[PDB]
Swiss-Prot record, chains A, D:
GO biological process per UniProt: negative regulation of viral translation; regulation of translation
Record annotation: effect of changing T45A: Loss of repression of replicase translation. 80% loss of binding to the operator RNA in vivo
Localization per Swiss-Prot or TrEMBL: Virion
Organism annotation: Escherichia phage MS2 (Bacteriophage MS2)
Entry superkingdom: Viruses
GO molecular function: identical protein binding; RNA binding; structural molecule activity
Protein name in UniProt: Capsid protein
Keyword presence, Hydrolase: no
Recorded GO CC terms: T=3 icosahedral viral capsid
Biological function: Capsid protein self-assembles to form an icosahedral capsid with a T=3 symmetry, about 26 nm in diameter, and consisting of 89 capsid proteins dimers (178 capsid proteins). Involved in viral genome encapsidation through the interaction between a capsid protein dimer and the multiple packaging signals present in the RNA genome. The capsid also contains 1 copy of the A2 maturation protein. Acts as a translational repressor of viral replicase synthesis late in infection. This latter function is the result of capsid protein interaction with an RNA hairpin which contains the replicase ribosome-binding site.
Record carries keyword Membrane: no
Family named by the database record: Belongs to the Leviviricetes capsid protein family.
Amino acid sequence: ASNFTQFVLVDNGGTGDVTVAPSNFANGVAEWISSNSRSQAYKVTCSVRQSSAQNRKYTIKVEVPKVATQTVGGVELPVAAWRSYLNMELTIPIFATNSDCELIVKAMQGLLKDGNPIPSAIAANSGIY
Amino acid sequence: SNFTQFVLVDNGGTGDVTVAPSNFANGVAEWISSNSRSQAYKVTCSVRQSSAQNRKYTIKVEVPKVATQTVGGVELPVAAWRSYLNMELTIPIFATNSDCELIVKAMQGLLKDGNPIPSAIAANSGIY
Amino acid sequence: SNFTQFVLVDNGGTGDVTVAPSNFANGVAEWISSNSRSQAYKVTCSVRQSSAQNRKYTIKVEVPKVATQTVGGVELPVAAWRSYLNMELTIPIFATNSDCELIVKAMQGLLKDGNPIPSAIAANSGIY
Amino acid sequence: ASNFTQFVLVDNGGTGDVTVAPSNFANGVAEWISSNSRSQAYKVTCSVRQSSAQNRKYTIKVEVPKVATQTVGGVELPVAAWRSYLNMELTIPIFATNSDCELIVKAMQGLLKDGNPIPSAIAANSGIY
Amino acid sequence: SNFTQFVLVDNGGTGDVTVAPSNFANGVAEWISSNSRSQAYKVTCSVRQSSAQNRKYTIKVEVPKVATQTVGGVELPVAAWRSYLNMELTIPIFATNSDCELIVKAMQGLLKDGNPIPSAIAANSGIY
Amino acid sequence: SNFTQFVLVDNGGTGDVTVAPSNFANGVAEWISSNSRSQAYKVTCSVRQSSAQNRKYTIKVEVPKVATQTVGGVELPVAAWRSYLNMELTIPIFATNSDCELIVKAMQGLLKDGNPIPSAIAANSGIY
């Protein structure tokens, strides 16, 4: 019943889906990577800690690479042209029940739902106006 | 124009939480729900050129604690009743529109129901 | 594999308290119940080689105060609502499996119903 | 109606049971020992004190010896090859009623019940995974 | 999850040596066989980013010689001696899954029965 | 004689990588695959008396990535990068042939298909 399982990070409709699988749990940080070389792989990391006496903090990081082939010293190597970084920090009081956490999760899901302002602004290289 | 209201929490039509625009000072968009500022859902979004090669999106979400809450009452301490989400998205300036759509899809798939991270968050648990 | 859920408090089938796995960071197993983290039963267990000749088990149990409690509410101060058990078991490296079973039986018989220590704890009393 | 009585520490099913009996109450520490020499005897100690203004702390210690015969200077002596130590510290708020203490006791009993993860891990010289 | 129990020495069903996870402190996974710790097989594995382009694996295995020590009439389960294996594998970050599979295949074929190195080790001899 | 040709990478008849003896200078045996030396697999083995009671084996394997370099219009067969394996096995002089066979069996079972370490190496990942 472990939750350290693989999941589809980018859903392209069956074909072309990006899937990340568990790869590391050292130092209390769970890590997911895609089935590529580590210089061209998507990376997802999650960790939870007791920040204050009455607060718990989640730290989630996502790395989205742009794959490319670079010629270094006459030899072609698989590299990433650039990487997009997502940094998420969620602080939840210790008094929050399971229903409150479900509310937080639903709010996070609805924040980035297709058609909403913020995802549309991100996908259009524009701000909110 | 995209500064409109949207359903932040979807409950199947009944009980939906809708956040409407409430502030645009300094170019930062803000959405709040029909509640007091101590018990409301707040979403803020802004984008800026962080470095010479990167653009950074700053998204902040505030979620109230609903269980055993008093609507319109004074609930103290504040830190014991509010959940804070601070999301930062760094995109290099070379990314096209399709790359941004791919990043958006990755973010959506990260928090899709049934995936490890949302299940861990929703169960007051970590990764095991 | 032994990282599974188990009945922490047995009430004869009805009202049983079950703790399920919730964290495995740094190799430390953690169990919590279906409650908020301020009102839940928490069990953590870890084993390490403390010295050159001994292995040490560290077991920590947290029990909430149930009498006159508000389910899902903010109860302060924290120290007035939680009971903390910190158990440390030191086993020399020369102990076989049978020796470990004997130690487990000794620990079980120490807290068996009717024995002095559990009766003293359950009656808010000492040894008289 | 005193609770300073003897009890079976290790229940081997009638035959071979290890029984500890009261032996000392000096300096506020109740002590149980088995009917052996003090170099080969099981020892159980319990004490309660008012740690803070609103907290009470129980201190329970159990010693499990491994009996052996050692030849020192040509003479055989009853000693213990090694000793296993259990240290328990239980902090209970002063606002906890008898029902809350019964809940704590039941949780402690169910933590070490046969078949549960922690006792199985201890009895198998392994951790939790 | 790969932090599970596995057979270290395969003796054909009966007499197999099995190691179970025991500790994951400081990012170093550890496997220990059952029974007395003094006469137990130990396997440790850890992976780190050595350089900007390389990832290094560190694997250690200890094989004990089971014996009984008698000093002054006291019998203790100990190990007469231990054999220590230290493996260090460096893999560049440009290696794909196929490259890692090929490296694993090479490592397996290095110690396959009938090959020079395992035959030399099993015969208490070198290369001749 | 064990200083013979053997298959390093078994690809099922076709595509097998074979290494042949090339040098035995200073007590270090060396195996090199055919064709260009720049894109050749290298295996070296040497055994020495490290201490008064221990014998140490030193085994090194290099796996190249075959590539073609073009500088100024001149094409040369080179290796884009190489993976280096360093193994050091210490065996006490008290070990018999059975003990050495058991050590070899342990080494083979460490890298057997399906086991944690080879699966991690072949998947470009660590222990999770």
